[PDB]
């Protein structure tokens, strides 16, 4: 059900005064008042794709956290029913009030305020995302551990998500900039006085949009650079781990060779430890002779094992 | 062969009474009665893609479990020969009878009933799919086992399948909503009275379709979130298993070092266990001296092995 | 070279009698007799893509094993030079003779015979492919072996190939069905009598083609289901093998712990086996005391090793 | 720099005599003499894509090793400056001279010679590529070795490269065949006499091009079959290697069990080898009793280890 | 903010004298002076895609390191605010001054200078990239090490990046060459005198652009060849490492067999080392008999182990 969702709205009139505070307005009343279309509101209500639409009496903006309807006399900010106003929305409202209470027309000032708020939020989000990755990379320079690699991958996923979001916002602004008739139709005050700019006269809007398109492009480039650096660090860590595993295997082989070398001498001592006739008992040289022979044979076995271990891994 | 498949049909007249109960009607008789086309029925008979088609005297619906033909006076629900009516179909029939026996026209009420049944079935299927995954993830928080990972992957496949099905249904409704002439052609009662709405007057149908498009979109988003969480859990489990394997290898190396350390002292005891002249027999200090020397050499070998094991894996 | 390939041909006249038996006809003579075009024959001669083409005096069919030219009076089946007639071709010829010697026109009966032969061959090939996979899956339920997995993959490749072939045949029939003017141009007997059906009158051909399109679709669906089941079985087998490898590694570690535990007691016995003064000789309690001490120390070492092995793999 | 590259050229007049031998001609002189365009010569000079272009007074061919300009009276073969004539180019020149010195027009004979040379070179290259792979596969049937697998992969890369080259040549001929106005414009002798063939009269060119398109298609199919066979052999070899590794691991485990079984009996003998009171000295049955007990315990330990090894890997 | 960025500019007049040295000019002043459009300057200011644009009174070039505006009387080189002139830019300025102070028009000479500078920079960058890879590949011919493989991959990434950059530059020149009306519009001096070349008269520009397109294509081909060689070397190194690992495993197995072979003889010596009645004491043959028996049994165990090791890995 729920045919009418009773959206939450706030409005500002021509002089910048708060003509209406946070209230509940139906969709039908909003459509009747602003003369909109259901398709435009349905496009706005999607919270995945930003949109900047122009209509012969309105400008519709659905950016990251702003749902704004700008007319030549009124500005409306709306949201879903039951939602509470956040700090960025209050800051945007205060900035819009300050700019409107103070040459540029009304709609251009509103658009400037919206773009300034969006760029500030983008920069703050980028810094908040970027700082822990720098801290982790600083900590990883001393020792290499698998948990740190897992944390690095977890942070890299968030960096990629933010890069995608910033790229989407920049592409929306670029697609608005590429159109020519929309920039001509963005003049509302001259439209009220029956003046048409034409398709060859749009100077202020192009500069105003470019001045923030550049700011978005810088953030996108920086995010891409951070992603590349993270990937390189991960590759280096993996190579180091593989080398460590190979060294451990070689050490185990050397320990096995040593064990065999001791076992041979233990066997020889056991042979002369029997309860039989050795024929060299009660002689002074027997003990030293057998000890030297056993030690020499153990050393020879160890040397042969080490030599063949060196010869095998020569390739 | 089988030129005529003799489809099973049920019909409801204008007053909502059951004018005909479950029966067998040929394809040719159905085409002659309803004035359809073979291509539309062939498109409907496919059980892989949902379809909402409009014709100048009919509305054709092939959703998840409904094959419905809506006219301005009659409603027909049909299925393949030999099939038995299920509980959702009986519930839909009862709901349609209750809504029609009771302002909105006939076809809009039928469409509302169909959409309500489809959304209810989608929500029930989503809950039934979602519950075992939550139970498995709750059980996996204590211990990690490979069989639980296999069960998690098996359930994730079903979640992905349901997400694809819900996405297909939502895309069908969205594609119907985007068209403009179809919404104008959806008025049948006014068409009987020779009244044409035009391409600029369609208000009721747009709201009615949006009110269920939103409900489908919510389910699609929730399924995507569940899939992402499952993937993250699988990655964490794999990392834990790799760390466990490395720890086991290190323990094996330490055991080898201990074995060598004991073997050296065993060799020394075997050297002094021979049946020869030791020159220190019948002396009080010999036993303690040899015992201390063997223990000291074993400890030295163990310490050197542990030190080199620590030094190797420093990188 | 080889400008003229001298294709092998067989022909049947209007009354169904064999007017000509297996013979050698040049390409130029065939083109002059049937009034064809080089492009159509070049399209037919490709043995990778099936084709159903319609021309104002002919129907051209290049299916799996049939190269058929159907006219309003004659039917020709042709093949490459030097080829021998197989059993399916002879069966198709006998069936066509029986159907033509016996309301439906000539070309529709020929098309029915061709489609029946193709569907029968498809079903026979599917059964022959499907049976060994079922046998292998039945044998694999008792024990898991790598050779059986290799055989399963080898059979799965053939199942995928047959699925692709059946999908290609079904897509050809569907693409023929979607066209509208071709179905109007498929009437040759009425074309001889200067009667044109038009673009709104084609009933018999649509039903006739749908009745075999459904039969192809069923086989495609069954092949896809078999492929999915094979993939699931392969995944289960791989998981079982990995678990077996981990269990073997754990058993090896336990054997190493046991070896160390015995080695410690062997060292202690070797210490008291020396030819020196033990100070407890000729006493009754010495043997039992040393035996108990060595056994106790071996058990303590084994218990400590097992406890640390349990503690390491807790994660 | 190098505005004019001074291409190397050879020419043949209408009677087939060598009117000019290998010489250096500028690009501007060639363009002025033949009335060409810079774009066509730039397309020809690329050595990666074959091209068959038709112009109202010329035919331009850039195949594998031929850069040929055919007119109704002259034939020119050109190449880069400083290059030397190879054996295939000399053979093509001799064949062209023999065919022209001898019904078919001039340009069709030149095209026939070019296509014959290209097909002969393709077949020779295919045989030269194919032979070593067959030799390696014959040698690999006795024993499996990693170096042979590396050689097989190295040869498979070359087979894939040749398959791609042959596919490119066949696609060029097919794209020339599909065009209709080009085949009409390929008649130059009739164009000199002011006779136009039209878009419905082209018989000789189609057969002439098809007779070599088939020859290219055969080679492409054979190369694809060889690639598939190589891939299957590689998969079989990898499976065999994995089975060998598993068998080696099992053998190592059995050796460890045997070592433990001997160690237990060595410990028991060491216990009775001490210099204490055994209480069974100077008795006849003691030696046999202890020997039998130690052997029995060693056999019991070995049997238990083998039984648990069998029980672990049952899954 | 920053509506006007105050770009850094340098200018050269018709006679080639430096009419203005490095200065700061606003975007609005540049647009008013040169009669440009905001879209063209926005396209130029992107530093990722090279561009060669033609306008009825200007030529706009944004290559690797040059931002050049060429008119029929003036040449301007510009860059961002705060940047310092580099050595390639100074060399390009000196070369342009030397060429202009000295038949070809003004704009063609400027374009020749720009293309010469770009090709020289491309060749220098290619040589600087190529040399360390050759040095590393020369050093790797003696011994194989993982660090050298890591360095090889690191250098291969840079080679791929340079190949992509050169491919982008070559594609820009090719796309400029393919256009026909742009080459006609590239004549500015004739445009001042009201002479139009037409779409069929452009000879000088085509040759001038081709003479550098070839130079770019050569560098792209050489970079691709280097990348392929690097990949082949990496594959060979990986195969060698795998063979080394297998050889190490076989050596470990042989060491285990030797350890067991010695352990058996040690057990037999321990059996005859006990303090019981051997019944062969005070006999001459006992010592030699037991020594020979123990050595023979150890050799038999070693031989059996080696034989079964050979038999296992036969497949
Ligand atoms: C007659 C001349 C013939 C040629 C001379 C011999 C040339 C090669 C040998 C030197 C023998 C010294 C011991 C080196 C054995 C190497 C294997 C081994 O296990 O030794 C150590 C650890 O064990 C250890 O730290 C010591 C383990 C016990 C050593 C084996 C028994 C030594 C013989 C009996 C000594 C009482 C393994 O680590 P590495 O330091 O890398 O060994 C290689 C360099 N020592
Ligand atoms: C003269 C001063 C020289 C420096 C002092 C030595 C410094 C380093 C050594 C301490 C020796 C104590 C035993 C530690 C050996 C480590 C290898 C080992 O196998 O021990 C244990 C298990 O075996 C065990 O639990 C015990 C196995 C038997 C121990 C080897 C023989 C000990 C010598 C003979 C004792 C009668 C392996 O697990 P971990 O607890 O992690 O070992 C490291 C910490 N102990
Ligand atoms: C004083 C109280 C201290 C705490 C009590 C000890 C608590 C823990 C120990 C029980 C010791 C019994 C032997 C278990 C050793 C485990 C390692 C081992 O190699 O034993 C077997 C195979 O070897 C075998 O089947 C036997 C190998 C030889 C056993 C080692 C020497 C035993 C001591 C000398 C006995 C004459 C390994 O397989 P598992 O059955 O899984 O072993 C774990 C359960 N037994
Ligand atoms: C009282 C009745 C209790 C049940 C009877 C025992 C049933 C199971 C045992 C038979 C024992 C014979 C030796 C088989 C041990 C298996 C492990 C082993 O290392 O033996 C061989 C190689 O070593 C070898 O070739 C020989 C290595 C030395 C053998 C271990 C010591 C034998 C005891 C002392 C003999 C003087 C391993 O390879 P396999 O042939 O596959 O072993 C399994 C079949 N023999
Ligand atoms: C009665 C006739 C029966 C048939 C004759 C026997 C046929 C097969 C055997 C020859 C035995 C000689 C020793 C070869 C054992 C092979 C395993 C081994 O560990 O030896 C070496 C290293 O250890 C070594 O370098 C030596 C390790 C100690 C050798 C084991 C004990 C030898 C017996 C006691 C000798 C006093 C392993 O490396 P490889 O050279 O590749 O061994 C294979 C070729 N020797
Ligand atoms: Mg050991
Ligand atoms: Mg011992
Ligand atoms: Mg003794």
Numbering used by the authors:
A (entry chain C), B (entry chain D), C (entry chain E), D (entry chain A), E (entry chain B): 162 to 263, 271 to 483
Extract from the study:
The mitochondrial inner membrane protein Mrs2 (mitochondrial RNA-splicing protein 2) is responsible for regulating the Mg2+ concentrations of mitochondria in eukaryotes, providing controlled uptake of the ion14–16. CorA/Mrs2 forms homopentamers with two transmembrane (TM) helices (TM1 and TM2) in each monomer, which are preceded by a soluble N-terminal domain (NTD) that regulates the Mg2+ passage.
Consequently, to further illuminate the Mg2+ conductance mechanism, we prepared a new CtMrs2 sample using a mild isolation strategy with the inclusion of EDTA from cell lysis and until final usage. Two cryo-EM maps, with and without applied C5 symmetry, were determined at an overall resolution of 3.2 and 3.5 Å, respectively. The EDTA-induced structure preserves the homopentamer form. Remarkably, among the most displaced structural features are the stalk and α5 helices of adjacent monomers, which are well separated in the open Mrs2 setting, thus eliminating the M1–M4 sites. However, while the conserved R314 has a peripheral orientation in the closed configuration, it serves as a wedge in between two adjacent stalk helices in the open conformation, through interaction with the invariant D410 and N414 of the neighboring monomer, thus directly influencing the matrix-facing end of the conducting pathway. Interestingly, while we expected a Mg2+-depleted structure, we observed cryo-EM density at the S, P1 and P2 sites, which we tentatively assigned as Mg2+ despite the EDTA treatment of the sample (the P2 site is not as distinct as the other sites in the map calculated without imposed symmetry).
